[PDB]
Amino acid sequence: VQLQESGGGLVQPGGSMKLSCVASGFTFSNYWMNWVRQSPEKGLEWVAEIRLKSNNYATHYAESVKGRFTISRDDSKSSVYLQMNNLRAEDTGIYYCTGVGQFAYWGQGTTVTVSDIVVTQESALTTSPGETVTLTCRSSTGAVTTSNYANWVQEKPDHLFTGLIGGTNNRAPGVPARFSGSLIGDKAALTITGAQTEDEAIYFCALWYSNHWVFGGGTKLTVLG
Amino acid sequence: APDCRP
Ligand SMILES: *[C@H]1O[C@H](CO)[C@H](O)[C@H](O)[C@H]1NC(C)=O
């Protein structure tokens, strides 16, 4: 599976820009597609989703971009697009197309340079090879339950994302067995049973709230020795 | 309620 974005670059405040993403290796037309952006200050932030032809290609948007961005898809070309008008400085960031159960696949990102629910994660955790470590994800609204469809996404050196878990407890394809997701108490949880040195990464959770996703701030996992 | 298709 590849997702590959293009269209980024320098834009003047108030200007417009169109991003493209072409998908291969999965049945594109059977899945919703999203755009998520990563900034220095605001972290990972879900921008937009577009659903299937059977959903009349329904779209939903983050409040921050509603009225300025338009997401669309061409199932005939296995591609999703993001039209962005009236850009602002806060729109600066790396933009990713992503989807499947629910954020298994990520493109490499395309950079756009212009010129409330809170999900909480541990800032950092330290472990060693062979230990069991559990990362947690809390919602400012109450309990996390299966209706929040908790996803866990791994960021490895320099903005390389891969989804590990979706729908609370479901390992994406090809994800190592040492990763599992669950609900623990009133939080979503990612457990690594036998941490490995290569697991040193930033881990983000995302929770679903009716018609939008909110990403956590991320947990830096250090694996010592 | 989001894309719960595997
Ligand atoms: C999960 O999403 C799939 C595909 O979008 C189906 O719509 C399924 O019915 C969904 N489940 C719920 C509870 O809405």
Numbering used by the authors:
A (entry chain H): 2 to 52, 52A, 52B, 52C, 53 to 82, 82A, 82B, 82C, ...
B (entry chain P): 1 to 6
Give sentences copied directly from the paper behind this entry:
The structural features of MUC1-like glycopeptides bearing the Tn antigen (α-O-GalNAc-Ser/Thr) in complex with an anti MUC-1 antibody are reported at atomic resolution. MUC1 is a heavily O-glycosylated membrane glycoprotein consisting of tandem repeats of 20 amino acids (AHGVTSAPDTRPAPGSTAPP), with five possible glycosylation sites. Consequently, some peptide fragments that are masked in healthy cells, such as APDTRP and their glycosylated analogues, are now accessible and can interact with the immune system. The SM3 antibody was selected because its epitope recognition mode is similar to that of other anti-MUC1 antibodies, which expands the scope of these results, and also because of its potential for use in the early diagnosis and treatment of breast cancer.
For the α-O-GalNAc-Ser derivative, the glycosidic linkage adopts a high-energy conformation, barely populated in the free state. This unusual structure (also observed in an α-S-GalNAc-Cys mimic) is stabilized by hydrogen bonds between the peptidic fragment and the sugar. Notably, the GalNAc unit and the peptide backbone adopt an almost identical spatial conformation in glycopeptides 2* and 3*, with the main difference being the conformation of the side chain of Arg5. Therefore, the selection of a particular peptide structure by the antibody is somehow propagated to the carbohydrate through specific carbohydrate/peptide contacts, thereby forcing a drastic change in the orientation of the sugar moiety.
